[PDB]
Design an enzyme around this catalytic site. Structure first.
Site, PDB file in Angstrom:
ATOM      1  N   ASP A  35      59.673  61.992  59.022  1.00 48.09           N
ATOM      2  CA  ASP A  35      59.414  62.186  57.592  1.00 48.09           C
ATOM      3  C   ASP A  35      60.371  61.325  56.776  1.00 48.09           C
ATOM      4  O   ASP A  35      61.520  61.726  56.559  1.00 48.09           O
ATOM      5  CB  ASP A  35      59.612  63.654  57.252  1.00 48.09           C
ATOM      6  N   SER A 199      55.305  49.340  43.258  1.00 45.22           N
ATOM      7  CA  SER A 199      54.142  48.523  43.528  1.00 45.22           C
ATOM      8  C   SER A 199      53.764  47.719  42.290  1.00 45.22           C
ATOM      9  O   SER A 199      53.964  48.151  41.150  1.00 45.22           O
ATOM     10  CB  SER A 199      52.979  49.421  43.959  1.00 45.22           C
TER      11      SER A 199
HETATM   12  N1  LIG Z   1      59.402  65.849  52.559  1.00 48.64           N
HETATM   13  C1  LIG Z   1      58.601  65.044  51.916  1.00 48.64           C
HETATM   14  N2  LIG Z   1      57.991  64.071  52.556  1.00 48.64           N
HETATM   15  C2  LIG Z   1      58.325  65.273  50.486  1.00 48.64           C
HETATM   16  C3  LIG Z   1      58.116  66.563  50.010  1.00 48.64           C
HETATM   17  C4  LIG Z   1      57.874  66.782  48.668  1.00 48.64           C
HETATM   18  C5  LIG Z   1      57.815  65.727  47.769  1.00 48.64           C
HETATM   19  C6  LIG Z   1      57.456  65.974  46.347  1.00 48.64           C
HETATM   20  F1  LIG Z   1      58.218  66.904  45.796  1.00 48.64           F
HETATM   21  F2  LIG Z   1      57.557  64.913  45.594  1.00 48.64           F
HETATM   22  F3  LIG Z   1      56.200  66.388  46.215  1.00 48.64           F
HETATM   23  C7  LIG Z   1      58.037  64.438  48.239  1.00 48.64           C
HETATM   24  C8  LIG Z   1      58.293  64.213  49.582  1.00 48.64           C
END
Ligand SMILES: NC(=[NH2+])c1ccc(C(F)(F)F)cc1
Ligand SMILES: C[C@H]1CC[C@H](NC(=O)Cn2ccnc2)CC1
Length: 330
Positions: A35, A199
């Site tokens: 992630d 982008s």
């Molecule tokens: N852990 C992740 N990949 C993740 C989770 C939430 C958000 C958000 F809050 F922007 F929605 C962005 C990224």
């Protein structure tokens, strides 16, 4: 050093990707969701509330001769989809694709929310955003990449996600056979802890390219492509019968449609997402209404270049002193 591991879709829709990771001595292999939008390495474990484990492989620190409790340390994370998990912390040896880190913080879950329990294919997360987002308290911990970086041949990792097919995460090198053309690099802001970039615009299908700055994150841990409402409306307007459904929670379209491609800009370069990548299948089993893979970011507060976008590219996460992102077609 380098490492190279295959990453595999968890299901027929590419809802997420899992990568095998070796933890402990002897090795315990867990399939983790890499992630780039978070910074915690956490696992289902022998400590996880038993009713919240439903088919996952667990890490058992008491069976690892290299595991050590990180005294007093706890963690707790909530994600953008409303899911969450929390627990305590061990240090242990962690290997990915032949690359080994000793003393990695392995966050052992005591509690996970229902959507984690319900997904038997994901044994935990391996965060690859910046370590400033790591949730361990009272002493924040480093990501696997942050710990490995100095040992790597080059301070990079790459994501090469497949469409309905396996792909690869590499650490420490760029596989010049894995992409076409050149890699275009673009600036990153680390101020929010993400691989955040801008982008240069977009096109829908064969339409003309619209030059416009779109600030967003490169996020392997998000399934879909979340963009401003104007951009998303312009895309779905090209699909007969598509509509935004408040009851479903986004844009839906007739499953009989052939979707147009979507192009995004990286500097002067262009990455083309084929239309099929944007089909996330029936909204419920047997429905002829299908869920779209491009959705509005309105109310998220950030645009997200998730798997739908990243899988169309070979992506370099460059962790040099000034981080950057690279994108190539493939
Ligand atoms: N852990 C992740 N990949 C993740 C989770 C939430 C958000 C958000 F809050 F922007 F929605 C962005 C990224
Ligand atoms: N929601 C997401 O964007 C990620 N996800 C995790 C498991 N299935 C999908």
């Amino acid at each position: 050093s380098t490492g190279s591991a295959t990453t595999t879709p968890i299901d027929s829709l590419d809802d997420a990707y899992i990568t095998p990771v070796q933890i402990g001595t002897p090795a315990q292999t867990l399939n983790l969701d890499f992630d780039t939008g978070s910074s915690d390495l956490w696992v289902f474990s022998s400590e996880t509330t038993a009713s919240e484990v439903d088919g996952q492989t667990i890490y058992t620190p008491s069976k690892s001769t290299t595991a050590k409790l990180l005294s007093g340390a706890t963690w707790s994370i909530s994600y953008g989809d409303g899911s969450s998990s929390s627990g305590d912390v061990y240090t242990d040896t962690v290997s990915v694709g032949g690359l080994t880190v000793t003393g990695q913080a392995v966050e052992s879950a005591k509690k996970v929310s229902s959507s984690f329990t319900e997904d038997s294919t994901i044994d935990g997360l391996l965060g690859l955003a910046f370590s400033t987002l790591n949730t361990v308290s009272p002493t924040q911990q480093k990501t696997f990449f942050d710990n490995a970086k100095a040992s790597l041949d080059s301070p990079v990792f790459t994501a090469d996600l497949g469409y309905h097919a396996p792909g690869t995460y590499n650490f420490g090198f760029i596989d010049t056979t894995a992409y076409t053309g050149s890699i275009t690099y673009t600036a990153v802001s680390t101020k929010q802890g993400f691989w955040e970039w801008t982008s240069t615009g977009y096109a829908v299908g064969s339409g003309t390219f619209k030059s416009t700055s779109i600030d967003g994150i490169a996020d392997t841990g998000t399934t879909l492509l979340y963009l401003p409402a104007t951009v998303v409306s312009a895309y779905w307007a090209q699909v007969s019968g598509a509509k935004s459904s408040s009851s479903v929670g986004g844009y839906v379209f007739p499953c009989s449609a052939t979707l147009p491609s979507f192009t995004f800009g990286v500097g002067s370069a262009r990455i083309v997402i084929p239309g099929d990548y944007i089909d996330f299948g029936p909204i419920s089993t047997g429905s002829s209404s299908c869920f779209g893979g491009i959705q509005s970011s309105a109310g998220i507060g950030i645009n997200i270049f998730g798997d739908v976008a990243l899988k169309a590219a070979f992506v370099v996460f460059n962790g040099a002193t000034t981080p950057t992102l690279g994108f190539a077609s493939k």
